[PDB]
Amino acid sequence: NKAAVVLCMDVGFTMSNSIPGIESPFEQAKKVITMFVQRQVFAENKDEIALVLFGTDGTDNPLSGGDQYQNITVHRHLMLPDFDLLEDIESKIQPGSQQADFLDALIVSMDVIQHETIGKKFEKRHIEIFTDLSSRFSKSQLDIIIHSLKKCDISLQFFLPFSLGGPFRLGGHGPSFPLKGITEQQKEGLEIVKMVMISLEGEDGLDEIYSFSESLRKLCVFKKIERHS
Amino acid sequence: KYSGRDSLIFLVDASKAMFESQSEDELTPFDMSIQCIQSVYISKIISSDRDLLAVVFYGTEKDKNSVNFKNIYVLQELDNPGAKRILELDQFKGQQGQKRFQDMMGHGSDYSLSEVLWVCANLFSDVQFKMSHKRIMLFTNEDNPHGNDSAKASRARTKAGDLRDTGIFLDLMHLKKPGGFDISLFYRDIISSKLEDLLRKVRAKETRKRALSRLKLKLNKDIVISVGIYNLVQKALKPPPIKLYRETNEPVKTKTRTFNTSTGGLLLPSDTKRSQIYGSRQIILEKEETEELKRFDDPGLMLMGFKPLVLLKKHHYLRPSLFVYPEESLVIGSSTLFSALLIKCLEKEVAALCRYTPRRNIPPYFVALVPQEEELDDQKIQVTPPGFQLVFLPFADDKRKMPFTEKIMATPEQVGKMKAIVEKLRFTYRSDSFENPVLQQHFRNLEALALDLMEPEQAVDLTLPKVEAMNKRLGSLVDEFKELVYPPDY
DNA sequence: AAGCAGTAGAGCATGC
DNA sequence: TGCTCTACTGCTTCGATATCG
DNA sequence: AAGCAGTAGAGCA
DNA sequence: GCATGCTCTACTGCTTCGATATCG
């Protein structure tokens, strides 16, 4: 019946990183998110979207306690997406250079999803995560939030960028990373997200690690949306 | 050629004996011939309805022909199968039809010889079309129509050769006088019996052979050859209606328009836009933009590499496969390259993969070219011609995903009795014959409408199985197959 | 697509 | 305050219509 | 332009 | 040096049939 999808997107400075000859990861995330919300607006289906950005300059957040919860803003609640939720995507040239964390948008989106299921029946809770994974982590409480992810039975898809280990353009059935797009911070990021995904849902979390190259190549954004035929 | 229609003259022997019942009480050979001719017209009126069909009785008393010969009387003329001509034809049945034959033309005369073939020749000469095949189908029994004069025999075998050279071929359905294969006599020179193929066997068929597209195969850069994409399984359907004015039964020449800008006045097509509303607002285009937003490629097949025949799973399916062939009409020297690529693809079990655009503005479409090789013996059996096959391939949103979440097994004992049941129902499948009941009953409905005979000839339903010839065929193992482990158990 | 059938246009030969 | 009719109804498959080679 | 079961609003109790 | 007279060949459009996409 009614779908309630949520996007959470890193809009950080490194996400708007410099171009060695290819593209910005910010513009790649923009192309992918325009493809998805473009299909789910032009298909006239009865779903609602809510989107959260992290890596901004200000914090107009419903919860900003201290040093944590910085540069996170709920753009829009669960709405049938019109062209306003597409021009908020398109007319947003600013990346807003002040980057804080990457795990905050999941718990803020979970809190507002709980606030958004107010007498409105929903069968799916799918949240898609774009993160370049360049900032440091935050490890205050982990098993309580992993327990909430487990008990609420929500879905978390993970778009990592092109760095997965000739002319790499966007996606052409060629290479994922051109020659080297990784470092120590990206290494610990990839291993900690593999650990969380495997330990929560299993080997499908190894399959739910999608690169920005191939997510434009294939249909991998639409999952657990349709019904029996 | 392409539009060269088939011709057929029926030539019937009505001279001395067949009008009589050959001193029998069963079926006169004259009635046999009229039933066979009527069944051939009834078959070709919907089987091949552009061909030419004439009918000529010889040996009768009075005569009419364009040549003005004695005792040769034509009935119809070279044209299509017409319902009014077969309703003229069906009046020569039984004793009353035999007497109608008598009062109309009268049987019995000094029947001559090859001048009847001359009348057949002038009947073929005056057509104003093109004809592929010329067949004279002679319906007779006897053996010696030149039993006294030898010059008549020499003239007969001269005029038959004069029909032999310019492309007119005859066969005679030899009427068995006692009902057997007896007369092994000396007309194997004139000719190049069984009549069931003339009696029933072609109730639904159509004759056509078209190329469907004539494209180019390019090896992704500049290397171009020609190919033409023929069709094999086209999913035929009944012909569509025609509007008609029920007073005089004439069609009514439909014309339509768009008008009325809420005042009065036409709109020639230059002042209409093409719109799509999406909730609140509109999106307006022009007709040329809404036809331009699907344009990707030149028409043809661009090659994108090679894959073996094994890893493409031939159950992925959305459209029937077509069939390529290497013409030498666009480029020259293409059958050489395709034969070389085909034998190397065969001896390395590999298949081509391509991107395909049929027409001058069509979005692109991925196809798989899988080879095949022919087969031929002394009997000239033909199940495969030597080309490729274009398996169409789905992209991404053709496949749905079923809910899948059940898994419960049982004991491996029912597989033996089910093997016994499937071996009980084991047979060779077919080569033809599972005909469509809806189209066939519609055919016979139209037959009985245009001929007002009696009734709908109820078509036998071959698509239905034979439950009487299946249940007692398998026997009393169905109770044990039902109640070994699984009765519903209440 | 397939067949055909009808006319436009260019080049040789002529005239003032 | 409790279980069958009922208005809808999304879909699905021919049947008529229009385009293109 | 026609049917087939699925999913929430009415009628007698 | 300019205008006309005459033929043949290749381009081009029409007609019929069949297949495909579309709209109810």
Coordinates of N, CA, C and O in Angstrom, one line a residue, chain A residues 39 42 44 83 219 227-229, chain B residues 277-278 281 283 396-397 400 403:
Chain A
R39 N 12.0 9.3 -11.1 CA 11.1 8.2 -11.3 C 9.9 8.1 -10.4 O 8.8 8.0 -10.8
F42 N 7.5 10.9 -11.4 CA 6.8 10.8 -12.7 C 6.1 9.4 -12.8 O 5.5 9.2 -13.9
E44 N 3.7 8.6 -10.6 CA 2.4 8.9 -10.1 C 2.0 7.9 -9.0 O 0.8 7.7 -8.7
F83 N 7.1 19.1 -7.4 CA 8.3 19.7 -7.9 C 9.1 20.5 -6.9 O 10.3 20.9 -7.2
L219 N 19.6 -1.1 -11.8 CA 18.3 -0.7 -11.2 C 18.4 -0.7 -9.6 O 17.3 -0.7 -9.0
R227 N 4.9 -4.9 -5.1 CA 4.1 -5.9 -4.4 C 4.1 -7.2 -5.3 O 4.9 -7.3 -6.2
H228 N 3.3 -8.2 -4.9 CA 3.1 -9.4 -5.7 C 2.3 -9.0 -7.0 O 1.5 -8.0 -7.0
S229 N 2.6 -9.7 -8.1 CA 2.1 -9.2 -9.4 C 0.6 -9.6 -9.6 O -0.3 -8.8 -9.5
Chain B
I277 N -0.9 16.7 -18.0 CA -1.1 17.2 -16.7 C -0.4 16.3 -15.7 O -0.5 15.1 -15.8
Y278 N 0.2 16.9 -14.6 CA 0.7 16.0 -13.5 C 0.3 16.6 -12.2 O 1.0 17.4 -11.6
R281 N -0.2 21.2 -12.2 CA 0.2 21.9 -13.4 C 0.3 21.0 -14.6 O 0.2 19.8 -14.6
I283 N 2.3 20.2 -18.5 CA 3.5 20.3 -19.3 C 3.1 20.2 -20.7 O 2.5 19.3 -21.2
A396 N 15.3 -4.6 -17.6 CA 15.4 -4.7 -16.1 C 14.0 -4.7 -15.5 O 13.9 -5.3 -14.4
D397 N 13.0 -4.1 -16.1 CA 11.7 -4.0 -15.5 C 10.7 -4.9 -16.2 O 9.5 -4.6 -16.1
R400 N 9.4 -9.5 -12.9 CA 8.8 -9.3 -11.6 C 9.5 -10.3 -10.6 O 10.2 -11.2 -11.0
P403 N 6.9 -13.9 -4.3 CA 7.2 -13.8 -2.9 C 8.0 -14.9 -2.3 O 8.6 -14.7 -1.3

